Amino acid sequence: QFRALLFDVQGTLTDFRSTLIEHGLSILGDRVDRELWEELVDQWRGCYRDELDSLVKQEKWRSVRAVYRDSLINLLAKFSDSFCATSAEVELLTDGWERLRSWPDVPSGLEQLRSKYLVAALTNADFSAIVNVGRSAKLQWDAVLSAQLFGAYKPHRSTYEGAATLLGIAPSEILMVASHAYDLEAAREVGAGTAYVRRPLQYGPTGRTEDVPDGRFDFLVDSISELADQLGCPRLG
Amino acid sequence: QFRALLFDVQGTLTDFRSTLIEHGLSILGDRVDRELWEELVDQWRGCYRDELDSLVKQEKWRSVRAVYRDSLINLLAKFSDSFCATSAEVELLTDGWERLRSWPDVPSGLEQLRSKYLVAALTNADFSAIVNVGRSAKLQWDAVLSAQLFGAYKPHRSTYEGAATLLGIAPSEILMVASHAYDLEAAREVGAGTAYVRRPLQYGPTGRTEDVPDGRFDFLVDSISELADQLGCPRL
């Protein structure tokens, strides 16, 4: 039934939280303790989601890198007592979102899926970010699709359907793979299949995760490889 | 100086002629001689090029698959005394353009380049076509860019510049890689580096060769691996 798997990347395929924590700490060093920087990372993603939530409501697209940067600048103002960052460091910190490392299952998972499916990124991240993430996260796609291509973020239907259009397939032939229910629900609305990837450490060792029940989505897996097995993709050697 | 190599794919990386000849012969079987099908394949590409020139002149974008299909249909009418195709075979024949096999240097050449460069396809083919060709030609990209993304075909500046902007890199940090002078000349006009890949068999043995001397483009190579070597990429 499915011709292509479209993947959310951040969190779903990538441990963005570990990346952004280690990245900030590498850049800022002694200037912020791990505990405070983790807090910042969490608020940063939170500001990002709030801005994207806003932009989706406004049916507007803007550079997600600019979203991360503006959110970071707003957050550095909030924490200006604790530490500061130069504009150069703001850019280097914001680069962290394009340095996401993948979960260990993901490369072999993606490779396994490719025997039977096209695999494409469908990310709200700017096109250049997902391309960069491809390198840090060792993601090799048939296609990289970004909100930037459609002028709209997920969950807007034009992303999934524009992905379907670009891939020359029906939305019903897309299996959306995400570790965020909103993404799957929105893909479902255009008729795509839904594959939920549990990422219990996505928000850290004490992070609160969606408790997706079986039967909510077409697939519910702990790894891309397990998804690949359930789609009948031959195992890798 | 280059952060990304942007590749034309058809001809540059793929032996489309051999692909389309073998593909058509597979589909049509006894119905067509190799010599006739070769001629049609060459005329088909020419109809595509003519129609693409029209659309480019005409500042419109159209599905390139539809361009191939429509031109094939027109060619089948011209060749109707010799053989026929059903509509299903028209689709299957048209699919050959999405089944391009690469020249043998290309996959390892692309792999050698990735150590230092982002490698992206920038094709006039539809997005789904180049994705499909990624499978048939074993092309693994950092990014797949199509004229379809830009509503304009190469050589239009919005393709190279859209590619640059999408990749988040200056055009001058793009090395455009193509086996067609027009593509490199247009990429040059937006500031991209130029690498001409000679493909002497691109149009088969009797094909006419572009007058591309050394120094006309930044690089002049016979393989993607050779380009990789000249760009300082270690062998894998």
Side-chain angles (χ1 to χ4, degrees), chain A residues 1-207 209-210 212-237, chain B residues 1-207 209-210 212-234:
Chain A
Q1 39 177 159
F2 302 121
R3 291 216 28 201
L5 268 64
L6 296 186
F7 286 81
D8 176 72
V9 178
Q10 185 188 113
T12 296
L13 301 186
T14 54
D15 182 356
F16 72 88
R17 187 169 189 272
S18 301
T19 306
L20 266 298
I21 291 171
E22 289 323 290
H23 188 72
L25 294 171
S26 182
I27 283 139
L28 301 166
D30 276 36
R31 282 147 63 188
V32 61
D33 83 284
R34 171 173 314 266
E35 181 200 342
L36 172 58
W37 181 246
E38 307 191 338
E39 190 47 56
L40 199 31
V41 171
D42 288 340
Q43 289 188 30
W44 197 356
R45 179 201 172 290
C47 300
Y48 159 86
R49 186 65 245 161
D50 297 344
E51 180 60 15
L52 239 71
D53 283 355
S54 180
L55 296 162
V56 170
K57 268 205 130 283
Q58 324 186 327
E59 301 230 315
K60 169 174 316 213
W61 176 90
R62 71 177 182 111
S63 172
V64 157
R65 178 182 178 85
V67 171
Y68 279 119
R69 178 192 306 111
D70 302 352
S71 305
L72 173 62
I73 291 153
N74 253 27
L75 281 175
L76 295 178
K78 283 190 30 181
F79 289 108
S80 56
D81 298 324
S82 305
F83 66 99
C84 53
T86 57
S87 315
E89 294 172 320
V90 165
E91 297 299 317
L92 292 193
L93 294 171
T94 300
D95 282 2
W97 294 101
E98 312 180 15
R99 284 177 92 271
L100 315 181
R101 263 169 326 260
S102 48
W103 301 109
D105 56 289
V106 170
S108 57
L110 288 184
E111 172 186 345
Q112 195 185 341
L113 293 168
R114 297 187 71 137
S115 59
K116 299 195 9 185
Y117 305 102
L118 299 179
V119 294
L122 180 61
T123 186
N124 283 341
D126 292 348
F127 191 90
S128 62
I130 182 43
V131 168
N132 288 331
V133 168
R135 294 310 192 90
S136 54
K138 302 174 225 113
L139 309 174
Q140 332 180 274
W141 304 108
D142 290 294
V144 158
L145 303 169
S146 160
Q148 184 170 15
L149 295 182
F150 315 109
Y153 306 105
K154 309 186 297 185
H156 189 272
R157 73 185 308 71
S158 77
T159 58
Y160 311 100
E161 287 176 325
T165 294
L166 282 180
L167 292 172
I169 60 183
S172 60
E173 301 184 283
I174 290 179
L175 174 54
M176 194 69 210
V177 187
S179 62
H180 316 90
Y182 92 85
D183 202 347
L184 297 183
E185 295 286 5
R188 174 137 60 194
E189 185 51 340
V190 316
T194 54
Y196 187 90
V197 180
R198 299 191 194 111
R199 291 296 190 190
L201 290 174
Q202 186 185 356
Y203 303 117
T206 73
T209 50
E210 300 179 306
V212 174
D214 287 81
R216 179 161 173 201
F217 302 114
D218 299 327
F219 304 85
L220 177 56
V221 299
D222 300 316
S223 82
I224 302 314
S225 286
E226 156 176 20
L227 176 57
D229 289 330
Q230 292 177 5
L231 297 161
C233 300
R235 293 235 281 289
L236 303 178
Chain B
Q1 45 207 246
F2 301 119
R3 290 184 150 38
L5 268 63
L6 264 185
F7 286 81
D8 169 74
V9 169
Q10 189 184 107
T12 299
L13 300 184
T14 53
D15 184 351
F16 67 85
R17 196 170 178 270
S18 301
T19 308
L20 266 295
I21 295 171
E22 289 334 302
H23 183 73
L25 294 183
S26 291
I27 287 156
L28 297 168
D30 298 308
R31 270 177 281 191
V32 80
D33 277 70
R34 166 170 299 280
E35 172 182 293
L36 184 63
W37 182 246
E38 299 206 342
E39 178 56 26
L40 198 167
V41 167
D42 286 344
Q43 286 189 38
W44 197 358
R45 200 217 155 240
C47 301
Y48 159 80
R49 277 265 164 251
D50 296 358
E51 160 101 338
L52 213 64
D53 286 348
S54 186
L55 302 168
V56 152
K57 140 166 297 200
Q58 213 102 69
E59 302 149 21
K60 309 119 172 203
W61 179 84
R62 192 161 83 100
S63 173
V64 160
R65 181 182 175 90
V67 170
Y68 280 123
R69 186 186 290 111
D70 292 347
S71 59
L72 174 62
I73 288 164
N74 287 344
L75 283 177
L76 289 171
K78 232 79 163 293
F79 284 115
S80 49
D81 312 314
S82 317
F83 69 101
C84 54
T86 67
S87 305
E89 325 187 278
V90 167
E91 295 306 318
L92 293 176
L93 289 170
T94 299
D95 281 346
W97 297 100
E98 317 191 8
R99 299 289 145 90
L100 309 185
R101 319 233 74 80
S102 51
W103 305 102
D105 57 290
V106 172
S108 60
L110 288 182
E111 181 65 35
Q112 189 179 352
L113 287 168
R114 261 175 239 123
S115 65
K116 281 175 46 163
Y117 305 102
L118 297 171
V119 295
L122 177 63
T123 179
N124 282 337
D126 297 344
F127 194 93
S128 60
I130 170 55
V131 169
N132 288 329
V133 170
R135 291 316 188 82
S136 59
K138 296 44 208 174
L139 312 178
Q140 162 71 225
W141 303 109
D142 292 283
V144 164
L145 304 174
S146 163
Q148 180 172 17
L149 301 184
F150 310 110
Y153 306 102
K154 303 185 298 182
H156 191 277
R157 71 169 298 220
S158 72
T159 60
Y160 313 101
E161 292 178 336
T165 290
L166 280 176
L167 295 172
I169 68 179
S172 63
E173 297 172 329
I174 289 172
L175 174 57
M176 182 87 189
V177 185
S179 292
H180 316 85
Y182 92 82
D183 203 350
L184 305 180
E185 291 292 10
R188 167 138 66 199
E189 188 23 47
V190 312
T194 53
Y196 191 87
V197 187
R198 299 195 306 187
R199 293 300 190 192
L201 279 171
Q202 184 178 352
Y203 308 111
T206 88
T209 186
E210 274 182 324
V212 178
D214 214 281
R216 173 184 190 193
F217 300 113
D218 296 322
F219 303 84
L220 174 66
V221 293
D222 302 322
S223 74
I224 302 313
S225 267
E226 178 187 0
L227 177 56
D229 289 340
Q230 294 182 11
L231 294 163
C233 310

